[PDB]
Amino acid sequence: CVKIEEVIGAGEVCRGRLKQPGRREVFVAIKTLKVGYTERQRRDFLSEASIMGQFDHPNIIRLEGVVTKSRPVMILTEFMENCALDSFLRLNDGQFTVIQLVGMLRGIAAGMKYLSEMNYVHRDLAARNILVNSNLVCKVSDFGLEDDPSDPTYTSSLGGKIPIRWTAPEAIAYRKFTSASDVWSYGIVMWEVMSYGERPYWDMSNQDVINAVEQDYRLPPPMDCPTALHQLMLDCWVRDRNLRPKFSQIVNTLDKLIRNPASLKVI
Numbered sequence: 024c025v026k027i028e029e030v031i032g033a034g035e036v037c038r039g040r041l042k043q044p045g046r047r048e049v050f051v052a053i054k055t056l057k058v059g060y061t062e063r064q065r066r067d068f069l070s071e072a073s074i075m076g077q078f079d080h081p082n083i084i085r086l087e088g089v090v091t092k093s094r095p096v097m098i099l100t101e102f103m104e105n106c107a108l109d110s111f112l113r114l115n116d117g118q119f120t121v122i123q124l125v126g127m128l129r130g131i132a133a134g135m136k137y138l139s140e141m142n143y144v145h146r147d148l149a150a151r152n153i154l155v156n157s158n159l160v161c162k163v164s165d166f167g168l169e170d171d172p173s174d175p176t177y178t179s180s181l182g183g184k185i186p187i188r189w190t191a192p193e194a195i196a197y198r199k200f201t202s203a204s205d206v207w208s209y210g211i212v213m214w215e216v217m218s219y220g221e222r223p224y225w226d227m228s229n230q231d232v233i234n235a236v237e238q239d240y241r242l243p244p245p246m247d248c249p250t251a252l253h254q255l256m257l258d259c260w261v262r263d264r265n266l267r268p269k270f271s272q273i274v275n276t277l278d279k280l281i282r283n284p285a286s287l288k289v290i
């Protein structure tokens with residue numbers, strides 16, 4: 024049933040084909056586990072496959088199937104042509120209209136609205152975890168495939184790795200991970216999108232980021248970013264987590280900007 028085609032990255036992420044008795048052949052992404060898999064590693068990989076299988080939404084990565092009967096174990100998903108959002112934007116620097124970028128952000132927010140409705144807290148919302156297809160539809164993902172190892176994207180923190188640049192201050196400080204801390208991460212995703220995949224906080228060290236945020240520093244609007252979009256980022260980054268908009272309100276605000284495109288001209 025599963026046929027491999029080419030290796031993408033390093034277990035490993037590969038491209039291939041899948042055929043089931045009743046449905047037509049579709050291109051798939053195959054997440055494999057490294058040779059000589061441990062009982063705990065196999066349990067962690069399958070518990071991740073079980074999470075993805077619970078969801079069904081046009082802005083959430085679709086799980087096509089899972090291989091359990093034969094080694095190596097596999098996670099099969101629908102192949103997303105344009106790969107990760109951050110890498111896709113960096114090579115397409117200034118090649119999209121504001122409306123297209125807003126549509127991408129609306130898709131991400133619709134996916135996040137669905138997750139929050141299912142009572143699921145993502146914890147790692149970032150442009151590197153958003154996949155893009157040929158039609159520019161953005162899909163929220165996780166458990167898939169480094170600018171400076173001195174200021175790593177993830178910090179080895181006791182219980183688990185934390186991406187400091189994308190994490191709400193209360194989730195860094197007290198591990199208070201909620202849909203509101205995912206909204207903070209979404210605000211960082213908005214900034215990554217409007218900047219065509221720049222590194223949040225630039226040269227600032229990871230410790231500088233925590234200190235600056237605590238002292239009310241907020242990322243400036245990227246070049247040519249409409250004021251309304253930046254204001255929405257600032258709303259996502261309220262220190263009071265109760266005042267941050269819900270994903271349903273973000274979707275509503277983005278739709279209001281799409282209906283009134285003149286508001287996307289004000290820079």
Ligand SMILES: *CC(=O)c1ccc2c(Nc3ccccc3)ncnc2c1
Nearest residue numbers: 052054098100101102103106166167
């Ligand atoms: C285009 C490209 O490089 C790419 C990379 C990874 C993908 C994934 N990853 C994934 C597989 C299994 C579980 C979670 C994420 N899925 C779909 N398309 C791509 C495309």
